[model samples]
Target: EVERLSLKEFCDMVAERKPTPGGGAVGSVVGAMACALAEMVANFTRKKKGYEDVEPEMERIVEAMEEARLKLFDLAKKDMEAFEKVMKAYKSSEGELQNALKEAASVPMDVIRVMKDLAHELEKLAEFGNKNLASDTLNAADLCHAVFQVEKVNVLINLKEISDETFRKNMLEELEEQEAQIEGCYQRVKKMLEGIVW
Candidate 1:
C-alpha cells in the first residue's frame, strides 16, 4: 500500500512514473507532516511556564492534529486505490467508470479539507503558543498551504475528466472557499512570525 511504504520507497515509486502514487498521494503526505508539526508545537507548549491558561486549548489542538494526521495517512493510500480503480475501469469495463472517476476526485477533496483544518489549528496555535516554538508552528502552516495547493491541482485535473457538470461545479466552489481559508490562515501566521526578530 502507499501508506505502508517507507519514505524512500514512496519517493522511488513516484519517480518511476507509476500513476498510483501521484500528486494526490504526495499532498496527503504533506498534510500528514503538517499535522505532526502542529501537534509537536502544541505538546511543546502544553506544560511550559506561563502557559497554564492555554493548556486546554493546546490539548484540543493536539487531539485535532492527531485525528487529522490519521485521516491524511489513510487518504494517502485511498487516493492511490481510487486512482487505480479509475485505471482498471478504463481498461477492463465501462460499467463503473463514472463511479471510480468520481471516487478519484473525491479523494483529493478530502485531502484539501484536512489541509485546511490543520492550517486553521496552526493559526490558533500561533495566537497563544510558546514563543520558542513559533517557527515550528508557522512552518506547519506554510506546509499546509502548499499541500492544499497541490490537492487543489489534483481536484481540478480530476474535475476536467468528470462528466457530471453539477458535481464538478460544486467541488470547484468548495475548493475555492477552502483555498481562501488556507490563505487567510497562513497570512495570520506570517503576520505573527514577523513580530519576532529571528
Candidate 2:
C-alpha cells in the first residue's frame, strides 16, 4: 500500500515526524529531482520550434531519467527498511556490536552510491540539455551537486564507527573519490553551461 507522492509532497513529508523520511531519503530525492529536471530540459529540446536532430538522444535521456527516478523512489522506501536494521543494531548484544555498526554504516553508503551516480548524470545533462535552459539545468545540477559531498561526509563518519577495517577503508576511499570527481565535474558543467548560446 504505497502512497503516491509527488516531489513537493515528498518534501512536505520530509518535514514531518516519521523517521524513515529523514535526511538520507530526502537527499536521494533531491538528486533524483535534479536528474528529472535535466531530462525535462532534453525532452523540451526535442519539441522546440527548431533543432530536432537532438531528439533521439533526448528521448534516451528521458528514459534513463525515468529509470533513475524510479530507483530513487525505491531508495527512499529503503530508508524504512534501513530503520529496522538500525534499531536491531542498537538493541543487539555486545558480541553482536559489529553487526549493528555495519548496519548503520551500510544505509548511508547506499545513499553515497546513489547520489554519486545521480550527480554524474545531472552533470552531463547540464552541458547537454536545451541551450536555453542550460543555466536552469546548471542550477538544478549544482544544487544536487552539493549533496554528494554531504553524503560522503555521512558515509565517512559512520564508517569510522564500524568495526570492519576493510569496509571502513573501502567506504572512505569511495567517498573521497566521489568527492574529488564531483568537484571536477562541477567545474566542467559550469563551463559548459557558459558556452550555451542562450
Candidate 3:
C-alpha cells in the first residue's frame, strides 16, 4: 500500500518511471502533511500557558486535524489504486475506461474536500495558536494551497478523458468553487500569520 511505504521509499517510487504514485497521490500526501503541521501547532497551543481561554477550541482543532490527517493518508493510497485501475482499463471497454476515469477524478476531489477543512483549521490555528509556531501554521496553509492546485490538475486531466460532458461540467464547477474556498482560507491564514509573526 502507498501508506505503508516510508518517505524515501514513496519518493523513490514517484521518481521512477512508474505512474501509480503520481500527482494525485503526492497531492494527498502533501495535504496530510499540512494537517499534521496544523495539528502540531494546535497541540503546542492547547498545553501552553496563557492560552487557556482557547484551550477547548484547541482540543477540538486537534481532533479535527487528526481525523483529516488519517483521511488524507487513506486518500493517498486510494489515489494510487484508482490510477492503477485507470491504467488497467486502457485495454478494457470504453465504459470501463470512463468508470476508471471517474474513480480517479473522485479520489482527487475527496482530497480537495479534506483540504478545504484543513485550510479552515489552519486559519483558526493562525489566529489563536502559539505565536512561536506561526510560521509552521503558515507553512501548512501554503502546502494546502499547493495541494489544491496540484489536485485540480489531476482532476482536470482525468476529466479530459471522460466522455460525459455533463459530468465534466459539473466537476469543473465544483472544483472551481472548492478552490475558491481553499484560496480564501489560505489568504486569511497568511494575513493572520503576518500580524502574529511580526
Candidate 4:
C-alpha cells in the first residue's frame, strides 16, 4: 500500500492532492528552506572584508545546517510513515488507542523540533552573519514561524481523536512546552528585525 515519490514527484503530489501538503510535510519543508537561507546568508558574508572573523563561526553554522537539513528531510518522510500507521490503526481490529495516538502525536512533535532548530539558525545568523542580510534572516525566521503555526494544528488534530487519557495528557504538556519555546525564540529574533535590510 506504499507509494514511492521522487523528489519532484513529491512536489507534484503536494501540489495536486486534496487535504495534502499537510502540516507535517509543509513544516519540514519550511524549516529546511529556512536553514538553506541561513546558509545563504553565511556563504554570502564569509569572505567579506569586515566579516572575516566570522568565517570560522559561519563554517560551523554551515555544518550544522547540513545536519539540520538532512534531519528535516527525514522528518518530512516520517509524515507519510505516521499517516500510514494511523491509517492502519484505523483499519485494524487490534484497537490499540495508545499506540495510535503516539504515532500521531510524534509526527507533529517532529515538526516542532525542526522549527525550533530553524529558529535558532536564524538567531545564529543574526549574530554572526552579514548585517546586510539581517532581513534575510528575518524572512527565514518567519518561514520557520509559519511552520510552527501549522504544526500546532497537526498536534491538536491528533490529540483530539485519541481515547487514551495518558497519551493525551502527555502530548498536551509537550505541546505547551514547545509552544513557549518557539514563541520565546521567535519574539526575540523578530524584535531585532525592525531595522535590518532585506
Error of 3 at 154 (Å): 0.4
* Alpha-carbon lDDT, every model: 0.87, 0.68, 0.90, 0.77
Question: Backbone clashes per model, in order?
Answer: 0, 0, 0, 0
| Displacement of the residue 97 alpha carbon in candidate 2, Å | 4.7
Sorted by TM-score (best first), the order is 3, 1, 4, 2
The parts of candidate 1 lying over 4 Å away from their true place are 1-3, 92-95
For each candidate in turn, give its C-alpha RMSD to the true structure in angstroms. Answer: 1.5, 3.1, 1.4, 3.1
Determine which window of 10 residues in candidate 4 has minimal summed lDDT: 1-10
Give the TM-score comparing model 3 with the true structure, all chains together: 0.95
lDDT of 3 at 35: 89
Q: Between 2 and 4, whose TM-score is larger?
A: 4
lDDT of 3 at 45: 97
- Reference-based TM-score, model 1: 0.94
Tens-digit lDDT string for candidate 3 (135-154) = 89998999999999999999
Q: Which stretches of candidate 2 lie over 4 Å from their true place?
A: 1-3, 6-13, 47-53, 94-97, 194-198
Using TM-score as the measure, name the better of candidate 3 and candidate 4: 3
Report lDDT (Cα) of residue 182, candidate 3: 95
Q: Assess every candidate by TM-score.
A: 0.94, 0.81, 0.95, 0.85
Whole-model alpha-carbon lDDT for candidate 1: 0.87
